[PDB]
Amino acid sequence: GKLPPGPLPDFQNTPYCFDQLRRRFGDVFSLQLAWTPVVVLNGLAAVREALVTHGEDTADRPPVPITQILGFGPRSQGVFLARYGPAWREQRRFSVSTLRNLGLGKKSLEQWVTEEAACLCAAFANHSGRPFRPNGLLDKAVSNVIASLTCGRRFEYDDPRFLRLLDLAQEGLKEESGFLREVLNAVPVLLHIPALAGKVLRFQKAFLTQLDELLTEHRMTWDPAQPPRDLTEAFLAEMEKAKGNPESSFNDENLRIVVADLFSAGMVTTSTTLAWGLLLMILHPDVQRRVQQEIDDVIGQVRRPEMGDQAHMPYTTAVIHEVQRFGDIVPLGVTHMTSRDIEVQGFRIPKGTTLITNLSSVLKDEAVWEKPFRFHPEHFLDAQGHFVKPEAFLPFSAGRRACLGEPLARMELFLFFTSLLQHFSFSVPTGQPRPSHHGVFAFLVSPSPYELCAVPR
Ligand code: HEM
Ligand SMILES: NC1=N[C@@]2(c3ccc(F)cc3F)CO[C@@H](c3cn[nH]c3)C[C@H]2CS1
Ligand code: NA
Ligand SMILES: [Zn+2]
Ligand SMILES: [Zn+2]
Numbered sequence: 092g093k094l095p096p097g098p099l100p101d102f103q104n105t106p107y108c109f110d111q112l113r114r115r116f117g118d119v120f121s122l123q124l125a126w127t128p129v130v131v132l133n134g135l136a137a138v139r140e141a142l143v144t145h146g147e148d149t150a151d152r153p154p155v156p157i158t159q160i161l162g163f164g165p166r167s168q169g170v171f172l173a174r175y176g177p178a179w180r181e182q183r184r185f186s187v188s189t190l191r192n193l194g195l196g197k198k199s200l201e202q203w204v205t206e207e208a209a210c211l212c213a214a215f216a217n218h219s220g221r222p223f224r225p226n227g228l229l230d231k232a233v234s235n236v237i238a239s240l241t242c243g244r245r246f247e248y249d250d251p252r253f254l255r256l257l258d259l260a261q262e263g264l265k266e267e268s269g270f271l272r273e274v275l276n277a278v279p280v281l282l283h284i285p286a287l288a289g290k291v292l293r294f295q296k297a298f299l300t301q302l303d304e305l306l307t308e309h310r311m312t313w314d315p316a317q318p319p320r321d322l323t324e325a326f327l328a329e330m331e332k333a334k335g336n337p338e339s340s341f342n343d344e345n346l347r348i349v350v351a352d353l354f355s356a357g358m359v360t361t362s363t364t365l366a367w368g369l370l371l372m373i374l375h376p377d378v379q380r381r382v383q384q385e386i387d388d389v390i391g392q393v394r395r396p397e398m399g400d401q402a403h404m405p406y407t408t409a410v411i412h413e414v415q416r417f418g419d420i421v422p423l424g425v426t427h428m429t430s431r432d433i434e435v436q437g438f439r440i441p442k443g444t445t446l447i448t449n450l451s452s453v454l455k456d457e458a459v460w461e462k463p464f465r466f467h468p469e470h471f472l473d474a475q476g477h478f479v480k481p482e483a484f485l486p487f488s489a490g491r492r493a494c495l496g497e498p499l500a501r502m503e504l505f506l507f508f509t510s511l512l513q514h515f516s517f518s519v520p521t522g523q524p525r526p527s528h529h530g531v532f533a534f535l536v537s538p539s540p541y542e543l544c545a546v547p548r
């Protein structure tokens with residue numbers, strides 16, 4: 092019956108405040124936000140006990156009132172914010188299966204991704220020896236991969252509409268944070284104000300509008316007489332079969348939500364991680380050279396990298412995992428909710444409680460990692476040089492809600508990272524201050540703005 096302790100009654104720096112509250116109270120501490128009860132879980136033990144051991148009771152999502160503006164409904168919640176039930180499970184299984192059918196885990200997508208990497212490399216080279224922010228180009232290349240899986244196409248890096256879609260998605264990501272989002276979600280009746288409802292998610296609404304245009308175009312080119320060439324076509328085919336069935340999650344409202352979630356996720360996660368990767372490679376040239384050494388020993392500077400090479404490249408694999416661990420791009424994960432009363436680390440957590448998984452505290456747990464606050468590839472290496480992955484490596488969280496994009500992320504991260512280090516050498520621009528290894532929080536944590544030089548090899 093003993094509830095977790097907590098302070099009795101900034102969101103632009105939330106992961107920072109939680110760690111201060113962490114060491115103060117403990118691993119499992121409670122805290123009050125408006126009329127919403129919240130329990131924050133810290134360290135591998137607490138997170139694992141909640142998401143795995145009590146996985147059936149913590150796989151649910153809290154209600155998010157402001158999503159009513161985006162056309163949400165019982166069979167229209169997509170996957171991400173979908174309540175733990177049939178609608179979530181139908182869409183989740185669909186995404187996992189459809190991605191797998193489209194060549195995820197095969198040589199097919201593998202060669203497509205490394206084709207986009209070639210386009211990315213060419214864009215890098217066009218900047219000569221000049222210093223530049225590589226973020227925009229990383230977004231485009233990574234976005235084309237997920238666009239290829241969902242929309243069945245890629246976009247040119249100068250495409251006006253592609254650029255706007257990426258820009259809106261990035262601005263929409265900022266709207267996923269802030270303090271205003273919290274108040275409207277804490278007390279929903281403030282949303283009744285018509286003048287207020289049009290500002291809260293101004294860019295996310297713009298993104299959806301821009302996406303609708305592309306979907307409409309895609310509908311026209313869809314050939315239902317042929318097997319689905321991408322995820323959207325597969326969804327449409329299921330939507331046709333589901334005509335007359337009110338229980339199906341395959342509807343128009345859900346099509347745009349699923350595609351939006353997948354595309355934007357496909358973009359801002361992998362590219363931010365890659366942005367962390369390049370930053371850490373110019374801050375640690377020694378590590379960069381050792382990776383390039385392994386590439387030349389396994390792949391060479393000639394042919395494009397393949398997923399078969401990763402098993403023979405433990406150091407590069409270690410570096411990539413360390414980029415994810417140090418990068419820590421989803422510090423507080425995604426909020427869960429208890430659908431039943433549970434027991435975590437002795438304390439009692441009642442049904443309906445919002446759970447916050449502090450994944451940061453797992454990736455940088457001092458009890459597990461040797462040098463949690465340092466960039467240290469040997470976190471994933473033994474003395475022999477073998478790749479080892481600790482249990483505390485949970486950047487994709489855990490349990491029934493664990494990131495479904497992890498297989499895509501894994502192959503994208505390896506294929507893009509290796510291809511970029513295979514042909515380029517990155518460094519801090521001479522005359523410029525040492526780029527901070529601290530990041531900026533906005534739900535996702537991106538590295539602070541930096542520039543680099545990309546000289547070909
Ligand atoms: C470095 C890359 C990525 C990281 C670190 C990451 C991390 C995460 C995390 C922490 C969650 C929350 C899991 C939870 O609720 O406990 C999540 C969920 C999710 N991610 Fe990712 N992700 C990445 C890439 C992707 C990609 C590429 C896609 C899609 C193409 C994707 C789609 C999703 C979806 C749909 C969910 C919700 C799953 C569900 O609610 O059942 N993610 N991810
Ligand atoms: N709630 C959402 N937030 C994300 C997101 C939300 C709103 C936007 F405008 C753009 C985004 F990218 C950020 O986190 C992504 C993510 C994927 N795995 N982990 C995070 C998933 C996307 C779409 S749904
Ligand atoms: Na995992
Ligand atoms: Zn198509
Ligand atoms: Zn460092």
Ligand SMILES: [Zn+2]
Binds near residue numbers: 473475476477
């Ligand atoms: Zn070994």
Ligand SMILES: [Zn+2]
Binds near residue numbers: 513514515547548
């Ligand atoms: Zn080259």
